[PDB]
Amino acid sequence: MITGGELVVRTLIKAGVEHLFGLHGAHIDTIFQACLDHDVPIIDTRHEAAAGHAAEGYARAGAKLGVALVTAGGGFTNAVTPIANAWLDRTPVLFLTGSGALRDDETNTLQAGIDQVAMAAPITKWAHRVMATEHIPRLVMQAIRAALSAPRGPVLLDLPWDILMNQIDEDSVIIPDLVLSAHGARPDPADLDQALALLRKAERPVIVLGSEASRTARKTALSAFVAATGVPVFADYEGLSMLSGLPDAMRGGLVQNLYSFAKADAAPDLVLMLGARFGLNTGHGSGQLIPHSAQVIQVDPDACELGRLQGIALGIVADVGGTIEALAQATAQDAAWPDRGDWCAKVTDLAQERYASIAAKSSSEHALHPFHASQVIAKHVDAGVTVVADGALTYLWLSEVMSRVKPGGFLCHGYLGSMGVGFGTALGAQVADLEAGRRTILVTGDGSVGYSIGEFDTLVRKQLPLIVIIMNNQSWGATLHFQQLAVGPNRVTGTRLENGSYHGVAAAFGADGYHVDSVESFSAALAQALAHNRPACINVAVALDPIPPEELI
Amino acid sequence: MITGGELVVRTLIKAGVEHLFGLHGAHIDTIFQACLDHDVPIIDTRHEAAAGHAAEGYARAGAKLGVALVTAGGGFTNAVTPIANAWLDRTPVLFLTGSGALRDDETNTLQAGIDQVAMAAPITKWAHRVMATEHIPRLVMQAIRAALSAPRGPVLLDLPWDILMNQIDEDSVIIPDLVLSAHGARPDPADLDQALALLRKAERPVIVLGSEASRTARKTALSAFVAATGVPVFADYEGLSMLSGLPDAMRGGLVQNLYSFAKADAAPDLVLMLGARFGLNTGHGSGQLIPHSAQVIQVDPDACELGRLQGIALGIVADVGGTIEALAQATAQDAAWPDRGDWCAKVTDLAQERYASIAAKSSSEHALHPFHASQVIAKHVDAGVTVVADGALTYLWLSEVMSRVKPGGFLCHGYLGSMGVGFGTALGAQVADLEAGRRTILVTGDGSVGYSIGEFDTLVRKQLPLIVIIMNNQSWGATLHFQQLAVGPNRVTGTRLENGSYHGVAAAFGADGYHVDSVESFSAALAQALAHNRPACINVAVALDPIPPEELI
Amino acid sequence: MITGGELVVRTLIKAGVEHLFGLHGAHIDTIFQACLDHDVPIIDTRHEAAAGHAAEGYARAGAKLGVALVTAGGGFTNAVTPIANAWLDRTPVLFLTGSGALRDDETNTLQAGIDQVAMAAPITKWAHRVMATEHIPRLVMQAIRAALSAPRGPVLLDLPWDILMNQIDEDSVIIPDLVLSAHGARPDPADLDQALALLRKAERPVIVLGSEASRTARKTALSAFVAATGVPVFADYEGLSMLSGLPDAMRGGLVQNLYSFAKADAAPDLVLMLGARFGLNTGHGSGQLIPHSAQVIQVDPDACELGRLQGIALGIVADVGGTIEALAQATAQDAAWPDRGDWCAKVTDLAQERYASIAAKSSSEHALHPFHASQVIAKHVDAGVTVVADGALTYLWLSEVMSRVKPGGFLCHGYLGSMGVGFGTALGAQVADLEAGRRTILVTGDGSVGYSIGEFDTLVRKQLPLIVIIMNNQSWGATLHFQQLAVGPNRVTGTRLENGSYHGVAAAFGADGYHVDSVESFSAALAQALAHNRPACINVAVALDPIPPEELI
Ligand SMILES: Cc1ncc(C[n+]2csc(CCOP(=O)(O)OP(=O)(O)O)c2C)c(N)n1
Ligand SMILES: Cc1ncc(C[n+]2csc(CCOP(=O)(O)OP(=O)(O)O)c2C)c(N)n1
Ligand SMILES: Cc1ncc(C[n+]2csc(CCOP(=O)(O)OP(=O)(O)O)c2C)c(N)n1
Ligand SMILES: [Mg+2]
Numbered sequence A, B, C: 001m002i003t004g005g006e007l008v009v010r011t012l013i014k015a016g017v018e019h020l021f022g023l024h025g026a027h028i029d030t031i032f033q034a035c036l037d038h039d040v041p042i043i044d045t046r047h048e049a050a051a052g053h054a055a056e057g058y059a060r061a062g063a064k065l066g067v068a069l070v071t072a073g074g075g076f077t078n079a080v081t082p083i084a085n086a087w088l089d090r091t092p093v094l095f096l097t098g099s100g101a102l103r104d105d106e107t108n109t110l111q112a113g114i115d116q117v118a119m120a121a122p123i124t125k126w127a128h129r130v131m132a133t134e135h136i137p138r139l140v141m142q143a144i145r146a147a148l149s150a151p152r153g154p155v156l157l158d159l160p161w162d163i164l165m166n167q168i169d170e171d172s173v174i175i176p177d178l179v180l181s182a183h184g185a186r187p188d189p190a191d192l193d194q195a196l197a198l199l200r201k202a203e204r205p206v207i208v209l210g211s212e213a214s215r216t217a218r219k220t221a222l223s224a225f226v227a228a229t230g231v232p233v234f235a236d237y238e239g240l241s242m243l244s245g246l247p248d249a250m251r252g253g254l255v256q257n258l259y260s261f262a263k264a265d266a267a268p269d270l271v272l273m274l275g276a277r278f279g280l281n282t283g284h285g286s287g288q289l290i291p292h293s294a295q296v297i298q299v300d301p302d303a304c305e306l307g308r309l310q311g312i313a314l315g316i317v318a319d320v321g322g323t324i325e326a327l328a329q330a331t332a333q334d335a336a337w338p339d340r341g342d343w344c345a346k347v348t349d350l351a352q353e354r355y356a357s358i359a360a361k362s363s364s365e366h367a368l369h370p371f372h373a374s375q376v377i378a379k380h381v382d383a384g385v386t387v388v389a390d391g392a393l394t395y396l397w398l399s400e401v402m403s404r405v406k407p408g409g410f411l412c413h414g415y416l417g418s419m420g421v422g423f424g425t426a427l428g429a430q431v432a433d434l435e436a437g438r439r440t441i442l443v444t445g446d447g448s449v450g451y452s453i454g455e456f457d458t459l460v461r462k463q464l465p466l467i468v469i470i471m472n473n474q475s476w477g478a479t480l481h482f483q484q485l486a487v488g489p490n491r492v493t494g495t496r497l498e499n500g501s502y503h504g505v506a507a508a509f510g511a512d513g514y515h516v517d518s519v520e521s522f523s524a525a526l527a528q529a530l531a532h533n534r535p536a537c538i539n540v541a542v543a544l545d546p547i548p549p550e551e552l553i
């Protein structure tokens, strides 16, 4: 005789999950008991939103399934921002929630009576309420299959208190394996051929990676394909870390710096989009990054994304990882590829030029320029580090130093653009980075850090050595800029935050707190915090007036 | 200057659509005007349900996109049953609906004020309301891409009266092409290898086809793969017609007759499921058709379906058509395949034995046995015929004669099990069959025909030579059987239909009407109607008491 | 030991329901068995849509709860149009639906796996799935209270097959009474005073009744209020029959004929709206019926409706029935009311003038004018007759003769404006009219009758003596008019219906069939059918070209 909670955890074990992120409630205590018995850690936070964002972080930074665990009612409703974020970001999280007992349904009782499945339906791949304890294993496994397959996304499994506490005889119900191929589907040989023929006869070809390249992590395949063709590779934020293993001469970097190419007479001839959607990060349908004049080969698992905002030449529905593999295989059997050395140097030179351009207009005459601050962070970024970015102006500036470095992970806002998401995200990422030997750095704004500032307590309780760097410009920055730029100099309201010692908050939570206002003071602080196996907060006084290039766009 | 309706039709044209199925309304009259101008026929019915099912029938029988067109309000709400059916049936239909003008939203006006998108969300791949006339082309095309890619399914595009009537200058908005590869994704080489290895070392292997094999229609690939391996092939209803081109010795027929295999000591060793889900048609998780002892290779575009009710050996998420192609390609390069002649003969003999078994207990001592009736239909079934089946007992009987024939199409109930769906389905099918030179026969129940009996008018108006065969047992038959069988002999209520001359109704609508009660009278009637390029109704008096084998299950 | 189906029926009994309207299915057979045992008739139709509309008709014509009963899957989806119609019409129907068993949820099984509750949520007052058999009584009763209270509306109760078949010991679960006051809430005395003060100092005051006056049927109170004040009373379609008991001199008739009042210098001074919403029937916010210059007193149970499209003077949220009562009570204690005889005559004269105006332009030079046809129906309309109206042009013409007669019921399209709804509606109404001794006449279009033409069978099987009058103009009339009027003379497509003997269809179903083409032939036919306790169809050949005054609007 065992509980439905046991059933959940036994299935999670068989799926290979090793960590869950949650906040306790009576409704879901059978899952806690089971995890205690099985030595499965639940990283318990101070807010369900932080718990959900940790699950995302864990998934995004480890390329794993993330699992979030929340109680009925407010437990679920506090998880909604994570679910929506993961939905837009194509990130694989199983959200497990409690709900009211099915017996005594519709009795106006504690934490019951909200349609949690209806609320999640618009923003999950699947959302469903379990009706019987016996169904737990097959439904947990089905939810996980939905989460993990292309395009990845969140799933909500709602488990009534009733269903969880009820006891059945183990050995009346079978726990299935996760039987799902790890290699995705790949293009038809004729599409691959055509794609390769177009790639071969292009003068200025370019590859753009998006989130699905990251989720599948086919690093050795990518790098064989890139080495054979010499075609320079860009990424949106989520795909960036997939460039870390490529040879320098073909790291184009973040797609944004594709911006100035047209006016340099170097607008790409052809673009191979591998899970990079037409939208915010790729410049919508504007043709400012992905030129209207270019032939586009788009590979996405969702047919809707294929040429959504712009005409394309070849539309392939397939898995991105499977496709990368296929390109490598076809390309190992090839080796008649034109040089592209000149084109690669041009790509390199343009990225380099934007950087030096920015550098030529940055200061400290009584105050630290956000670009200078980002540079200080940049010199510590390599494959042994995951960078998590939050807070508008902060990350638009940070982005300019991200292309020339090679992070193990880079986790920035997706389409949701939700301020505050970073803290939970970074905490989940650090958990995943512990097995891989990486340090997680969170770079956030003074506004954004306030959303989840209580997580400092969690960092100390759980001994997670996350470094939280706050770019402190005394304001909701991008948003203050909008008011001045779009309305007028004296139209600034509700956008100032001229109060609060954030390092003191961290100190009062047990975390090491630093405050800095200079290139040299910040440098020393970050170095000292990296040297300690200890969580930290670095409160960086930074100038507000400078406008990052990406903002004017 | 052109209308939003023009924009819709121009985009449909470029997608290659050649017929729409609808019922007129003022709200959507711009689409009618445009179709009139471009010579695009709209097949207008007597009920939006019939229109919607016609779109299904056209898609299912032509392996094409089907397009339904309904007005705001009741237009949409009448279309809901077709949407749900297509959803469960993985059938590609674009449902185009009017809705209230966005200007004067929330003014309690005619046909406005129901959230049509919210209603369709639970049963569509995508459902969305267009907000601007300029968006019409990219959104129509996006909707079509979603409909057509794996697994196929319905899509609802809601077009406000406002948005449709409003005029823009053509040449300010571009009409995209349909750029979407026609070949689906295929398995990773290593998964294919493993699948083929398991297939090669099996003793009693079996292939089971489901709806996706049918949507992709890779007939020449399938038959090359079957010819190379000699592996017998079964299908659920929707997959059946895909067996019409295979050599007889490997036509297992409908999956149901896999039922008696276990007790004959011939339970399959291995089963290759190509788009056949675990569910109603495959015997759920019971192992009565797909044995628990068998190794299962499942190929489905939705990872959810992979081993949903039962353990599997290999779970591949890929397109079924692309998979079939890949198996043919790998299998042309092979030709070292074990005989399977004995096994195929065994498959053959079991199917044949079930048939003769049924035949040995069927009569006419004053009344025509439903099996004998089905046989009369069978002798007219070949590649030049699409059979559409409705009505419970009718189709459970019909199913027993469908395995030994080779129809160009077989369209039966799917998971929805919705009585009455057949009439509109057969009407759409007949439209698709006209270019292919086929005849459509509908075989339906006296109950089910009453759902859409007015479509006889549409047959006559539109000169569609459909033959409507009514198995008339004076009742909602299966449903009456349930009452006697599950409750008791004198517990029959609301299930009798002892009234109504259905051939008369057809005659009053201008269609040729026949009434028959015998093997010989029915035979003559069907032959005569097949000989005429004319729609017909054949009212067949048939016995009620007999229980089809499938019913006891 | 008893079934959940028993529980449903026992609770329905205690609520006082005496008829259900449904179509049988195995999933809901426990309800059929129970009704058979308790002598509760289920009127079984040929389409769930018809069943649902019958429930509406029964409720709308009897001022009762209507109860509809449909099976899982297609049974529910076919009911959707009735649900939506009842939603916009504020009509009290309990929709009881089957759904798949909760055990074996998510097994891809027959008729399961569509989120029926999600589909109904956007168009019900409450929609809910029952989780335990013990909950059936309290939940049925809850559903009924929701349906019956102000503003009335449809409710969906979803009862899994599981839940219905499962057996419990009766006497372990109590069946509650319907304990819900029959008298609605009434306005605060101060609001009533103010309303009465404004009404007393008005020069040209007017009352407009809507659906909620009809649901509560406070006939004796209304007529005491009207007799005390001498204030003329109008109604939208649904409120019309509430005018049948009032003195002639204060019967303004349908609100539409308030149209010409402004240009006659007689635009109302003040309007007391009793459940009449701003919307389609009251001319939206246009002030063509409810003048912008008038002081408006609006009484509605939904605060949202209060001045939704137009400024009002006094907004009261209360029940319309309770309010009418309160006005009668306050007004019995009053009797100092200004004359209004002149104003009433003026109202009378305007209505009369519109009628004579129309009459002066109607013909038969080879063809029967729709107006003349309506007049033939009018001479049989009194308190002993319920009129049901369908089909666009048909009812816009019929409406012009409705003001001067006094029907026991008038059931016309509401906001949904869904063609075809009439047939089931009239069938339900005739069931309700049987206890009250009334005859039901359906007046419908040739288009609309096609939607549910099979119900002629149901009329014969159930011996319901409905008379179905088809205004046959060989077309979807209003819709063809729109094309000529809005697009052009030769822009007529998919709007013609030049085929089909509708009377023949009725005769083939066992109903008396007539066809007529003249004032005198129609007159004889209608009289003969009224004389027989028998269902009938009168196919009326009617001219198409005439444009009803309401159409130009
Ligand atoms: C949850 C959420 N709240 C508000 C906003 C709107 N918003 C866009 S930028 C911004 C704030 C910037 O704050 P900060 O973290 O201080 O970063 P800075 O721009 O100062 O670097 C706000 C409020 C949002 N996108 N998401
Ligand atoms: C829309 C719908 N209504 C009701 C049912 C329940 N049902 C199962 S079998 C059956 C009807 C069979 O009647 P008929 O069309 O005459 O075929 P028969 O079995 O009588 O040959 C019904 C009504 C359903 N599955 N779908
Ligand atoms: C279900 C539905 N279908 C279509 C329309 C659009 N429409 C406006 S009136 C009308 C048809 C008129 O029907 P009929 O019964 O022939 O009316 P008449 O010819 O008497 O005007 C249609 C189709 C609608 N409002 N609802
Ligand atoms: Mg800031």
Ligand SMILES: [Mg+2]
Pocket: B445, B446, B447, B471, B472, B473, B474, B475, B476, B477
């Ligand atoms: Mg039957």
Ligand SMILES: [Mg+2]
Pocket: C445, C446, C447, C471, C472, C473, C474, C475, C476, C477
């Ligand atoms: Mg008509």
